[PDB]
């Protein structure tokens, strides 16, 4: 049924997915359905996400300290959508919009950081172990003439 | 400072890695020209069986416990070439990518599931009171708090 908790559960999952996705990918869950139905909802979606980049309450309900682990202010903000008994929607929607920007500000961080410190780990071991042998070769335009393949 | 000098060295590393990074994230003059042998050499270690065995035989999930121990193997013999020095840039890159492959969708995953968890509790009932989602196709207002 159109009402039962187990297709709205079900469709506002995929709606999300989709939502998110398109904003920013293998999630690994079920695929977002392509019929008529799931795309009309979809293309709402995104009208309504699209006027809320200019919707600036919601901007300012979703502006959010630097490190506050996304889960705190995830709960607070999103009660505070909802805090004065109304629904509509539109404040449905700028539910799926905070979560698609709470993705981009994690990712901002989280991948840098991420790559920084596997660099940092490279470089390391590289400035270590193989920076003389690399000065002993007249430095890096040894790379330039180097057609063989390494075994080990 | 100098082509030998450590300074330089260490300089020139940091941006051949950071863009090969960049490169494998994707899919100056002599730098670039560098950039370029650097590219050659990792897409032909692609096809180099023995070190995507060597990778295939480690955990890559758990880089921490892992870079060092398998950077070290890869010189363990004392030896060293060009192709040697790629292939660590090559691990590395991997371990990039294994963990954006899965903390990238993981991130994601736990969004979504606060967001659906609030919807269910807080949101379900309203839903069904307006026919379920299709109401939505019956909106062109903007919401304000
Ligand atoms: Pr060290
Ligand atoms: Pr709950």
Known sequence: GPTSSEQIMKTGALLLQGFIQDRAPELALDPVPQDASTKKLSESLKRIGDELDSNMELQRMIAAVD??????????????????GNFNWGRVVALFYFASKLVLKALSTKVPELIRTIMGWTLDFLRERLLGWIQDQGGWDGLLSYFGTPTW
């Open 67 to 84: 490190t506050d682990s996304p889960r705190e202010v995830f709960f607070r903000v999103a009660a505070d959508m909802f805090s004065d």
